[PDB]
Design a protein around this nucleic acid. Sequence first.
RNA 1: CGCAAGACGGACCAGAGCGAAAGCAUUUGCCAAGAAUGUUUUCAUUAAUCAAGAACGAAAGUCGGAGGUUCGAAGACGAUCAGAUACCGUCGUAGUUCCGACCAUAAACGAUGCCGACCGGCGAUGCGGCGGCGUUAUUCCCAUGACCCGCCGGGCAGCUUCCGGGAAACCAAAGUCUUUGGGUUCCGGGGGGAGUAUGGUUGCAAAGCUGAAACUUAAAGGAAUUGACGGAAGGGCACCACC
Lengths: 136, 25, 52, 213, 83, 62, 98
Amino acid sequence: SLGPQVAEGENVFGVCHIFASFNDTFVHVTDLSGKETICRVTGGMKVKADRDESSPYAAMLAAQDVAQRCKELGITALHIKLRATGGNRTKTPGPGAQSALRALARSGMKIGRIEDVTPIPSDSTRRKGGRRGRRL
Amino acid sequence: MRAKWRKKRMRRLKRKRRKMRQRSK
Amino acid sequence: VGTMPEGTIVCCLEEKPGDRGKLARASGNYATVISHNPETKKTRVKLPSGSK
Amino acid sequence: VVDPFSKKDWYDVKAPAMFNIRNIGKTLVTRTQGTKIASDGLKGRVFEVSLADLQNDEVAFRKFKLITEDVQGKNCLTNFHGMDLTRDKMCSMVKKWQTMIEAHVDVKTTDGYLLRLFCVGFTKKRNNQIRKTSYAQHQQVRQIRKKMMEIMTREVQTNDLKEVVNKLIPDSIGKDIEKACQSIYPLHDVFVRKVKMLKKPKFELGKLMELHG
Amino acid sequence: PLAKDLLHPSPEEEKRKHKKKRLVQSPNSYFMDVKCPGCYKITTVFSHAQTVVLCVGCSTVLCQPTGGKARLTEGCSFRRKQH
Amino acid sequence: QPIKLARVTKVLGRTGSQGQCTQVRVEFMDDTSRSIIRNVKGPVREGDVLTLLESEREARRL
Amino acid sequence: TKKRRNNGRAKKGRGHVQPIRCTNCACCVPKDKAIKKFVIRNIVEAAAVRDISEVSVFDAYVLPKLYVKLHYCVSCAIHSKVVRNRSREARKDRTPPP
RNA sequence: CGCAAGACGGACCAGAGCGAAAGCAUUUGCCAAGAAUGUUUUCAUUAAUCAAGAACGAAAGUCGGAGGUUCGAAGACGAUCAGAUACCGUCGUAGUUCCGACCAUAAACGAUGCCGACCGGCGAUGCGGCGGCGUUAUUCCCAUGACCCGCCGGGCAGCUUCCGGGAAACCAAAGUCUUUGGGUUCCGGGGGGAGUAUGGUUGCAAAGCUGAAACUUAAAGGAAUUGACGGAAGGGCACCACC
């Protein structure tokens, strides 16, 4: 896992893809392109219960288990691409995104740029649920 | 009874009378 | 079939080069040229049954 | 049973010399084992770089698609594969009580790089203006849209793909449209919101190395 | 306003009344003495002309039709009639 | 994060679930410019000294 | 009886409008009918803008906001306390509260 | 990263527009249509409303052909429960999409026929017109746009009020009503039975249109008020509440 990079205080970047949905949270550090990946540990890989896969605690342990693998493999800095569930479903990130983004920031991983790559439809195919909605 | 289903039970019931008039015709 | 784009409607299609027209040659039938492979020189073609 | 990161080479990613800042980032790729070559699996990575990290100290909301077009050795040679806006900017511009205008142009340069440019134009509320609405008549919108389309056939056909990007790093197309529509309906927030690469010609290595020098 | 002068309205009131709604129906249009600086005579052009006015002896076009009052070519002097 | 102390300047009211945490504007004993709002248990008055284990956390102002 | 002077909606001279699928439910609510919030918001709420700026690369890099337009149905606006049962006089007030 | 498909046309998008209603939102081209305004044009009562007769008419549904990405009646399963053959989850048939014929119904609602007149105000907006300092772009001036102050006509609305009305809620129309008459079409006569039976007629069918009676019953019902209650939203208070 050796790079030819100068290691005084120069930032090795690498874009990360945060699929922060409402039932789980992914923290997927890739290369600047994204075509080759590095490590992808989630809320459902740390906790072995389903009702706290999306929990802020689960995505903290995820992004800390990201950062250690990300430290060793020669990366210093992180570009961040936050994502919703997206499409016809919700466009607002879930309850694990802020806990996740902080968890690798408090580790010492440098934060480059942030943006939303929530796959928003220009115009939508018919969303799941009825005419009369999701009655509960 | 909803007035929408009262209607639906008259439509099934009329359907059954065309069914049983045809037994004689 | 090498010298036409994908989604091309054809008929009297040869299953092998030179056999002089075997596939998709009954009335109202068509085979769609699905995708090409310039290396190995081969093409997926959806037959009238619906099997590429 | 074994580490895939005992095989990963970290290569420089060169911007074309029409941009200022050189370094983009280092990208891991598996070395040659079997048929495939490390260059082959590295000759199609679209690098989406923000303008401010790519060009010295300018607007940071514009991004540029960059394809690794030919890999030499320890260096990845990029090329303008399209222009993108940050959605944080694009979504901040579409606000209520004004007219959003859009125009697309399917246009090809002297060197056969057929781009698809996407302009946007938001109608401006004047200084003394009390009226909340500030909308355009349908004909005024398609007098502006027809004006947008002629400009992006007048700056893309008329010169080559290296000389269009030095118009795209500034707002040379996003300022031209803003000024020339003040007389139809005076509009403020004009950019060219996206450029998508469609049709490249037959790849010659010399023209790529000429972008990197 | 209970006692109003419906008998004898003020002249400014019968500008704020529609041409049909005025106490005696009168149009807001006029005739005008339009000349061009080209030739030396005066022609009569209607205010709401709604057609092109070709100048005498096939000179040029003077009056361009618009939504209401048809425009005059820049320089063409107009003087409203007395009747 | 070493152990700092912060001096109470004024209590901003009682918050929590059962009305127990005095949400208090505290003044740092080191620098008299940076002052934060934090959650204090027990009976709390004006002028007394908390022991903050960090300068980092700050309570949600109602 | 006719509780509202409008029909709890914003068509007056249409006849028909496009239906919106709700965000909480997937109810088919008319667009003009539906309760709408254009939620502009920072990626972190209060407690995390401290630390994410400290370990940032750039010197004073302003973070991106999160521009999403929510469409609540009447049942999922009153359940999540977006709108609320006002007095028979104070319903008329079309004033967005500060 | 490319690709192929069939849907859909976010944000802009509004108590904004158009259309007879249903309905209608990506770019451009094309083809007819239409109101409003403008009009010192033209015909000169040609008009209003209409039994009978007809055109169009969301969705679903029917027939055939093509297509089937998503969604998804029926249906398979997993939950929930005493049970759920329900809500909730994953699948999925008809359908949802298009082409040509059918069907003619919706809380097809503004639950308010259409044409006309008259009777308050107020601030907006939409379309055309008219006029008025100045600001602004085409700069190299005019005229146009953008605003800015008004006016007229027409339209969708809004606020206001002892116009008046009404059982009231509310309504510048739902007003001009015992001081009872502008014109005209459809239409209702306590609740049920019943939009049923029957006969015709329409349709491939589902079903539409027309449509009673015997009998039954002393109320059903509208608007408002006070209370009680709520698995509505708040605001309190109490060691027979918590902390």
